[PDB]
């Protein structure tokens, strides 16, 4: 069973949220199986941040269990600002454990992330979440000469999930979202002063199929990572409590977390409300 | 100065909003001015909905001094759905006090039926607002809604501290500064109870927007039938409750009914049902 741990107050440079397995905190990066069912290619996401909020949120390659944390620019929160007509992230939007874009048809360097995940069901989700999903296609966004790929994902729980089995089927009972996520993802840093982003494929979304061979490319990088077998282990906390073969196991790490510490969410600027029309 | 007196929590049927000025309720239909400044056109808005909120809180027209309550359907909490792409309302909505929309009245050339309540304001600035709050705010243009047989005009409007306030004056301008919010507005009002398995709304005007001149004739027209109103002398008050505390030539004028609202009990904002998370794609 997998539950939730959080350090400190939401919207704070001290919030943290571990994922814990059974009472105990895993990396959320290492240690959650990337397959559910693989035989079903049902996947565990991990959710980073839930629909319609601003708090960039993210699993930290660089601390010990991975736990996620409010990014940061040069000291300060990161927050995505609200680009009409869209209101924070139009996703429930995290990532697959054990993948990773190796930074060594899109012809950009991988991100050095885990690959990234939509997830576009009717229930909004919670930070630390664990949740079943299947592939529906996957688009490449071309992001500072980087490519960052962006799985589209449904959980296996939405009552719709037995009528979407490929990308199509997203058009068909999600009619504007491909568009939404075209645009969302073109301009959303444009607020920030960074350019317009660009994807492949022309915005195209590919298929399931193209979105299960990616997938295993990069579970397939992820496992030579945390062997120890990259070329470049990029200053990534590998430590893990679940993978004993791996020279980076440390059963120890999970008790050397804090207990939790929860206290009331902290105010949001007001400026995180506003409208930029872009 | 305009504060709040919530009764209970936020999402449940107990819950309620008075309005108080000097710390004591006052009628949120009836006791704030129209005008924050005559002259000038700056009007007090009351805000029912914050922005990006969905619970479909109101005046409540039948209750003494007209605190904001949670609207029902069938004695169920009414929250309105989100319709793709957008969330939840998409303006700080809310209304003018000592404004209404005469039902009683015969327009037999338009065949127009006003819908019983102040009229409706559409507040577009870039900070989210608090059910209960009184902003001053500019009258900018206005459209009609013809929503079950009933005409609802929603004032286009903006708080005069947002910091575009100086530069939007008429209707013209919230398209230079909002681009696409006129369009959107159009479509959220004509689409946002689909899901309630209600009819797509149509708008007057073929959905234009028309300027702050014809605005202010409007607004104008319905503070004059709150007047008659207030004044005991409307045909039928539908069960409006009168009751005031500012206004000494009006009948129902009892400062005293202020003393009479329970003190604040504030308790944390209910758990809203999961389902209010859906987001329908009425295509
Ligand atoms: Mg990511
Ligand atoms: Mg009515
Ligand atoms: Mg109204």
């Given at each position: 069973?997998?539950?939730?741990?959080?350090?400190?107050?939401?919207?704070?440079?001290?919030?943290?949220?571990?994922?814990?397995?059974?009472?105990?905190?895993?990396?959320?990066?290492?240690?959650?199986?990337?397959?559910?069912?693989?035989?079903?290619?049902?996947?565990?996401?991990?959710?980073?941040?839930?629909?319609?909020?601003?708090?960039?949120?993210?699993i930290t390659?660089?601390?010990?269990?991975?736990?996620?944390?409010?990014?940061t620019?040069?000291?300060?929160?990161?927050?995505?600002?609200?680009?009409?007509?869209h209101?924070?992230?139009?996703?429930?939007?995290?990532?697959?454990?054990?993948?990773?874009?190796?930074?060594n048809?899109?012809?950009?360097?991988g991100?050095?992330?885990?690959?990234?995940?939509?997830?576009?069901?009717?229930?909004?989700?919670?930070?630390?979440?664990?949740?079943?999903?299947?592939?529906?296609?996957?688009?490449?966004?071309?992001?500072?000469?980087?490519?960052?790929?962006?799985?589209?994902?449904?959980?296996?729980?939405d009552?719709?999930?037995?009528?979407?089995?490929?990308?199509?089927?997203?058009?068909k009972?999600?009619?504007?979202?491909?568009?939404?996520?075209?645009?969302?993802?073109?301009?959303?840093?444009?607020?920030?002063?960074?350019?317009?982003?660009?994807?492949?494929?022309?915005?195209?979304?590919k298929?399931?199929?193209?979105?299960?061979?990616?997938?295993?490319?990069?579970?397939?990088?992820?496992?030579?990572?945390?062997?120890?077998?990259?070329?470049?282990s990029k200053?990534?906390?590998?430590?893990?409590?679940?993978?004993?073969?791996?020279?980076?196991?440390?059963?120890?790490?999970?008790?050397?977390?804090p207990?939790?510490?929860?206290?009331?969410?902290?105010?949001?600027?007001?400026?995180?409300?506003?409208?930029?029309?872009?």
């Amino acid at each position: 069973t997998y539950t939730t741990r959080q350090i400190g107050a939401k919207n704070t440079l001290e919030y943290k949220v571990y994922i814990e397995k059974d009472g105990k905190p895993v990396s959320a990066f290492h240690d959650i199986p990337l397959y559910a069912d693989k035989e079903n290619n049902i996947f565990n996401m991990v959710v980073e941040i839930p629909r319609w909020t601003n708090a960039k949120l993210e699993i930290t390659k660089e601390e010990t269990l991975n736990p996620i944390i409010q990014d940061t620019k040069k000291g300060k929160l990161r927050f995505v600002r609200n680009c009409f007509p869209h209101h924070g992230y139009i996703h429930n939007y995290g990532a697959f454990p054990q993948t990773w874009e190796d930074p060594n048809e899109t012809k950009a360097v991988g991100d050095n992330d885990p690959i990234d995940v939509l997830e576009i069901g009717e229930t909004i989700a919670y930070t630390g979440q664990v949740k079943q999903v299947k592939a529906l296609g996957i688009m490449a966004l071309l992001d500072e000469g980087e490519t960052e790929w962006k799985v589209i994902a449904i959980d296996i729980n939405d009552p719709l999930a037995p009528k979407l089995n490929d990308i199509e089927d997203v058009e068909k009972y999600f009619p504007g979202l491909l568009r939404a996520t075209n645009e969302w993802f073109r301009i959303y840093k444009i607020p920030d002063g960074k350019p317009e982003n660009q994807f492949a494929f022309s915005g195209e979304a590919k298929n399931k199929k193209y979105a299960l061979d990616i997938i295993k490319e990069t579970h397939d990088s992820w496992k030579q990572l945390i062997a120890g077998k990259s070329s470049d282990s990029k200053g990534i906390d590998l430590t893990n409590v679940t993978l004993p073969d791996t020279p980076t196991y440390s059963k120890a790490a999970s008790d050397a977390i804090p207990p939790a510490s929860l206290k009331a969410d902290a105010p949001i600027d007001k400026s995180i409300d506003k409208w930029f029309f872009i």
